[PDB]
């Protein structure tokens, strides 16, 4: 188990001196000699001299006679090494190995081989005093793919003293990884690099940071490299929004004639507001039925609008009662960037009623050569204009069919027609279509009439 | 003095191979003062041969030392995988301790051709006043590669430093990664920045280039 | 033609002396008085006194019966006014004005009101020096860039934007006096943000009471050197709206059609309106306008009328009515055309009363015109060769697979539904075999 | 002694309206000499009625004056486009000529907000030794504004400067001009600057601002 311990690396400036032990163990000390040899960057080893720890006889190189001082001490099991007026040049890994075993067979000194040596000691000599590293990405650019990958990477440079660790993606990047071996600067500041190769894809959707490390400083640094934007200040100015408006605006809508007088669907009214700046994009709403507040409402969520602009939307599901009976509604919305609060009302259109006529008619026969046909829903004399026309056949709702607008009569009643859409086949197989209509002036607020084919078939 | 001059500078091979070290000396060494030793990267050397030819305790029989007079070798009968390192040769004794340069043994494989990726200076960089132009030259094989930079078609040269890894342990191949470093004065003052790559697996010089700011 | 013409300004110093001339012409200067009167920045006119030329006699104001000589030279036709002991207070705008005719039936006196004013020499009194400007340009962030004229003395300064090149939007402001004694005005003009780059603003700052003349540059500023579709303003003020010809116009060789342009809030204040319109992007001056109209709630409404060809109109040539307010910042452009795609044939098919109507005494003749584009259709009922009257036809509708459709209903005694005569639904539309079909109605 | 006091102080018309002006005096003017007098800004004034009532040559028959005692009367029968200017009435004759303060008949057309913009000091006069900021309101109507600065969210006084133009002849609109003046000591010590406008064509008082820096 023959072993030998040195000290730890030093830095140390041009003038200085440096003095690394040797401490050995499992072999007798002082029945062994002790070689210090050093091997500077690019050089080969260099052997500097041998003390004896029996006698502390010592040779010297001529290279070191003159500046070395090899003293041993038994009771330590230690051989120190001291080199003093360290210039640049004696910057290396300065190393201590013993004899070989004094054989039987061999003559004085046939044995004095680097037989076991230590793990060396690094000694920087240089007049850099500790400085911390710079962080600046090697970016890829859009080059051609052709048919490979992309490589990015960090530069580590303008650092002293060495070492430095670094890591992509906190230990997540490893394979393809590349940190080159550090490169002393004219200005006595090591260099360096680490790279990684990664599919040229992935570019534009993975995260690559290095993270960098140089305790000499205390330093951490941890950059993104990110691909350099092709944009060189695309021209295109900040704040890109309109102001030109007493505030924002306020829309009111009422409820769909069919939810009013019929049961299945429940009576809503809508309050729409746009032109929501969005540098005061809070909006509150207000109801007041005829006068008497209410909270019972409920309010949509905020959308974007396509130039700059907020859609907001509360609506108060109403009642039958009310809005039949002519109950005044109120919406009042107020914002910051609104002068005033804008309210505006909404209630049924009021007029003297009038009973809707309702009519079928059948296709005219000229329709009856085409593949499909139109039924007809004439429905005149109502009043007022709110109606809902349905068409429904074996007890299930028609899809295809379009109503026009209530249209104002001569005598000031309205009058509309619904036309229906259906398959010659169905016309011609005797099917029975019916006309809904719902109207406030019509018994029971509901009227129907049929059509189908002549009897015959 | 004794002057040890070792051969061959690289000595690539497969495992299982047969590998033979030379160490020729300006010198006779009749002494037979001669020995071998072992250095990974990072670890302390290790004695492998002494008296030219005896294993030290630890070695398998797999190396033998042999020569006499002027030349010395070493021989590995069957390359294994935890060989490929430096070895050094030297004379030692009677205040004559002198070494070889090296001889080393890298892995084997196939001829591999450097994926060259080129990166102009960092926006930030040129605060400072010094523009970095890193060119990388990925996983390639045999070692010997040439690099030289052209700004402006301008043969450059004594301003770039180069870096190399070690043979990569998975694939047996390595990365190199020359800068080129001028004043953001120079650096402003071209147009073409390009770094032309040569190699024994490039049939042509590949040369990957960029121009001042452009995208 | 009487001419009071006044001498150049002066620019005197505390307690300094100024003496301005007034040369009469086209009357005979002595027999007339001459009145001088002053006005200080800000302050009411002063009458200082006159001078009668005929026989050198004065009068005094008590404010400036001390300091002031009103002189007259009976052969140069000129009357002066010498002022002493210059205060900062003296410094105003010095009036040369005559007195009127007199006349027996006029008392002594009762014309002595200013009938004829000079033009005013200006005299400003201030302890300050001749200064040249300061030029310091007002850089873009419509946007507008100026100039500032700062520190400079005396007035005038006359700045000039790309040597007269640049005139509308330009505002050279009125200078202010800053307590320094030295003057600070500011020149804007508001130009054209879509030029900020392609332009070269420059003003032409001149001051020749010292001989100072800095031109410089009103570029932006260094912090950037792509348009998706802006939208318009509204400074709430007048509005136009295009409508497109009567569907029965442009089928009818008879009929004339007219594409009207209509603008409403045109205010009381400025009423006039101008019209421009463009047939295609060239210019035409057929157009007619009508007499405005008084709204009921205080504004006008203006209307333009500009006849087209049927063919043009047919064919799909745009129609752009452009219109212009003083009130309008820029003027307001509307354009109109036939509506584009396939052109569609309509079917029209007519449909007799439905059974339980002919319980009532008027029936309902229907008549279903279907499958057509443009919507652009006009639909009448006749018989007897005559034009029937009582009947509505619903707008167009449009339909499940991109068509239009609508019904029109005609009203009739069920008599003589029931008496068989016949009637007949017209349509016009141009995707029509000739524009023109019709279907026939009747009993049994 | 005599004191003219004219009403109102401006009178806002539109063309074809009827415009009368009032000269109301401390003295009773028994011998009837008073004058009106019209003055256009740049321009020489003219006569416009003597002795109360008598048109002056080559004066609009549009034109009338009356009144008598202490209050005396100007009247445009229809204003005609060319009629704004100032109006000033005046005694005269035996060591009594006093003139009222005038009464501004101004163009009047439907509000319009102004274009409120502010500008930064010109680099070039921060060095110097004083700042001065800017802010322009273009083509608003009526003539009435209220520009108050805000130096970094504080109610400055006292050291700024209005400037209003004459009423355009074209849109008939003014356009203010107040400039903020600090020394570069003063300037930078704040960090945002601001200008308020208030307008009738503004219910919600604008300010339109720059933080004061590089862009």
């Known amino acids: 188990q023959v072993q030998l311990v040195q000290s730890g690396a030093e830095v140390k400036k041009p003038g200085a001196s440096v003095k690394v032990s040797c401490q050995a163990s499992?072999?007798?000390?002082?029945?062994?000699?002790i070689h210090w040899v050093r091997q500077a960057p690019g050089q080969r080893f260099e052997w500097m001299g041998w003390?004896?720890?029996?006698?502390?006889?010592?040779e010297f190189s001529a290279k070191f006679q003159d500046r070395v001082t090899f003293t041993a001490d038994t009771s330590a099991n230690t051989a120190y090494m001291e080199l003093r007026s360290l210039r640049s040049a004696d910057t290396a890994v300065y190393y201590c190995?013993?004899?070989?075993?004094?054989?039987?067979?061999?003559?004085?000194?046939?044995?004095?081989?680097?037989?076991?040596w230590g793990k060396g000691t690094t000694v920087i000599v240089s007049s850099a005093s500790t400085k911390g590293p710079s962080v600046f990405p090697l970016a890829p650019s859009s080059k051609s793919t052709s048919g490979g990958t992309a490589a990015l990477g960090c530069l580590v440079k303008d650092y002293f003293p060495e070492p430095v660790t670094v890591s992509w993606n906190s230990g997540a990047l490893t394979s393809g990884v590349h940190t080159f071996p550090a490169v002393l600067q004219s200005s006595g500041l090591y260099s360096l690099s680490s790279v990684v190769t990664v599919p040229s894809s992935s570019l534009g959707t993975q995260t690559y940071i290095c993270n960098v490390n140089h305790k000499p400083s205390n330093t951490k640094v941890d950059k993104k490299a990110e691909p350099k934007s092709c944009d060189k200040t695309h021209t295109c100015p900040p704040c890109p929004a309109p102001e030109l408006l007493g505030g924002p605006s306020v829309f009111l809508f009422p409820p769909k004639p069919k939810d009013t007088l019929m049961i299945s669907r429940t009576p809503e009214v809508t309050c729409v507001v746009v032109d929501v700046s969005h540098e005061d994009p809070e909006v509150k709403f207000n109801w007041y039925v005829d006068g008497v507040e209410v909270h019972n409402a409920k309010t949509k969520p905020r959308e974007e609008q396509y130039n700059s602009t907020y859609r907001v939307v509360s609506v108060l599901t109403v009642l039958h009662q009310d809005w039949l009976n002519g109950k005044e509604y109120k919406c009042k919305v107020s914002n910051k960037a609104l002068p005033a609060p804008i309210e505006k009302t909404i209630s049924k259109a009021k007029g003297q009623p009038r009973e809707p006529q309702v009519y079928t008619l059948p296709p005219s026969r000229d329709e009856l050569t085409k593949n499909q046909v139109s039924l007809t829903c004439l429905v005149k004399g109502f009043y007022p204009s709110d109606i809902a026309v349905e068409w429904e056949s074996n007890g299930q709702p028609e899809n295809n069919y379009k109503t026009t607008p209530p249209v104002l009569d001569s005598d000031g009643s309205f009058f509309l027609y619904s036309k229906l859409t259906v398959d010659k086949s169905r016309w011609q197989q005797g099917n029975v279509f019916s006309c809904s209509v719902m109207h406030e002036a019509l018994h029971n607020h509901y009227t129907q009439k049929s059509l189908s084919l002549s009897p015959g078939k | 003095e004794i002057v040890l001059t070792q051969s061959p500078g690289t000595l690539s091979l497969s495992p299982g191979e047969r590998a033979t070290f030379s160490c020729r000396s300006s010198?006779?060494?009749?002494?037979?003062?001669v020995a071998w030793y072992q250095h990974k990267p990072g670890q302390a050397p290790r004695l492998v041969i002494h008296?030219?030819?005896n294993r030290a305790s630890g070695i398998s029989d797999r190396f033998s030392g042999s020569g006499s007079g002027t030349d010395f070798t070493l021989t590995i009968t069957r390359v294994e995988p935890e060989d490929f390192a430096l070895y050094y040769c030297?004379?030692?004794?009677?205040?004559?301790?002198?070494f070889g340069q090296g001889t080393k043994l890298e892995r084997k494989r196939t001829v591999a051709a450097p994926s060259v990726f080129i990166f102009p200076p960092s926006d930030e960089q040129l605060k400072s006043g010094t523009a970095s132009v890193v060119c990388l030259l990925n996983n390639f094989y045999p070692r010997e590669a040439k690099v030289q930079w052209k700004v402006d078609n301008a043969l450059q040269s004594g301003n770039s430093q180069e870096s190399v890894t070690e043979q990569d342990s998975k694939d047996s191949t390595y990365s190199l990664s020359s800068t080129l470093t001028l004043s953001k004065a120079d650096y402003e003052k071209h147009k073409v920045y390009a770094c032309e790559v040569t190699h024994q697996g490039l049939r042509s010089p590949v040369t990957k280039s960029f121009n001042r700011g452009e995208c | 033609q009487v001419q009071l013409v006044q001498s150049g300004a002066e620019v005197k110093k505390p307690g300094a002396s100024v003496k301005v001339s007034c040369?009469?012409?086209?009357?005979?200067?002595?027999?007339?008085?001459?009145?001088?009167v002053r006005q200080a920045p800000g302050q009411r006119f002063e009458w200082?006194?006159?001078?009668?030329?005929?026989?050198?006699?004065?009068?005094?104001?008590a404010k400036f019966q001390d300091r002031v000589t009103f002189t007259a030279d009976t052969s140069a036709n000129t009357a002066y006014m010498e002022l002493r002991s210059l205060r900062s207070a003296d410094t105003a705008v010095?009036?040369?004005?005559?007195?009127?005719?007199?006349?027996?039936?006029?008392?002594?006196?009762?014309?002595?009101?200013?009938?004829?004013?000079?033009?005013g020499t200006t005299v400003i009194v201030s302890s300050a020096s001749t200064k040249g400007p300061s030029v310091f340009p007002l850089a873009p962030s419509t946007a507008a860039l100026g100039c500032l004229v700062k520190d400079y003395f005396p007035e005038p300064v006359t700045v000039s934007w790309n040597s007269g090149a640049l005139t509308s939007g330009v505002h050279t402001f009125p200078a202010v006096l800053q307590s320094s004694g030295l003057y600070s005005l500011s020149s804007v003009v508001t130009v054209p943000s879509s030029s900020l780059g392609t332009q070269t603003y420059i003003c032409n700052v001149n001051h020749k009471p010292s001989n100072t003349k800095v031109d410089k540059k009103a570029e932006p500023k260094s912090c950037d050197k792509c348009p998706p579709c802006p939208a318009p303003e509204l400074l709430g003020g007048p509005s136009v709206f295009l409508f497109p010809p009567k569907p029965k116009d442009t089928l009818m060789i008879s009929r004339t059609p007219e594409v009207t342009c209509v603008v409403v809030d045109v205010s009381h204040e400025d009423p006039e309106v101008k019209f421009n319109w463009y047939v295609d992007g060239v210019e035409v001056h057929n157009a007619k306008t009508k007499p405005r109209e008084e709204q009921y709630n205080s504004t006008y409404r203006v209307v333009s009328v500009l006849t087209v060809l049927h063919q043009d109109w047919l064919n799909g040539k745009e129609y752009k009515c452009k219109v212009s307010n003083k009130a309008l910042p820029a003027p307001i452009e509307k354009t109109i055309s036939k509506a584009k795609g396939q052109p569609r044939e309509p079917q029209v098919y007519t449909l007799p009363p439905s059974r339980d109507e002919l319980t009532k005494n008027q029936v309902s003749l229907t008549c279903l015109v279907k499958g057509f584009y443009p919507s652009d259709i006009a639909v009448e009922w006749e018989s007897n060769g005559q034009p029937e009257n009582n009947y509505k036809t619903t707008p167009p509708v449009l339909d499940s697979d991109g068509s239009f459709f609508l019904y029109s209903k005609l009203t009739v005694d069920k008599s003589r539904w029931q008496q068989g005569n016949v009637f007949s639904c017209s349509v016009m539309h141009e995707a029509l075999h000739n524009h023109y079909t019709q279907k026939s109605l009747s009993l049994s | 002694e005599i004191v003219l006091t004219q009403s109102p102080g401006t009178l806002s018309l539109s063309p074809g309206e009827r415009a009368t002006f009032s000269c109301?005096?401390?003295?009773?003017?028994?011998?009837?000499?008073?004058?009106?007098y019209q003055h256009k800004p740049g321009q020489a004034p003219r006569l416009?009625?003597?002795?109360?009532?008598?048109?002056?040559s080559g004066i609009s028959d549009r034109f009338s004056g009356s009144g008598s005692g202490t209050d005396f009367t100007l009247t445009i029968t229809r204003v005609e486009p060319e009629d704004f200017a100032l109006?000033?009435?005046?005694?005269?004759?035996?060591?009594?000529?006093?003139?009222?303060?005038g009464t501004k008949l101004e163009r009047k057309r439907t509000v319009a907000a102004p274009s409120v913009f502010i500008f930064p000091p010109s680099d070039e006069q921060l060095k110097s030794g004083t700042a001065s900021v800017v802010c322009l309101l273009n083509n608003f109507y009526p003539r009435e504004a209220k520009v108050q600065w805000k130096v970094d969210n504080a109610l400055q006084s006292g050291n700024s400067q209005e400037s209003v133009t004459e009423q355009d002849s074209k849109d008939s609109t003014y356009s203010l001009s107040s400039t903020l003046t600090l020394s570069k000591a003063d300037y930078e010590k704040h960090k945002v600057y601001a200008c308020e406008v208030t307008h009738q064509g503004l219910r919600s008082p604008v300010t339109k601002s720059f933080n004061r820096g590089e862009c």
């Open positions: 190995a013993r004899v070989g075993p004094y054989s039987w067979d061999d003559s004085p000194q046939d044995n004095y081989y680097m037989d076991v």
């Open positions: 499992g072999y007798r000390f002082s029945n062994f000699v």
């Open positions: 003390i004896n720890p029996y006698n502390g006889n010592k």
């Open positions: 010198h006779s060494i009749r002494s037979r003062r």
């Open positions: 008296g030219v030819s």
């Open positions: 030297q004379v030692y004794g009677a205040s004559s301790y002198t």
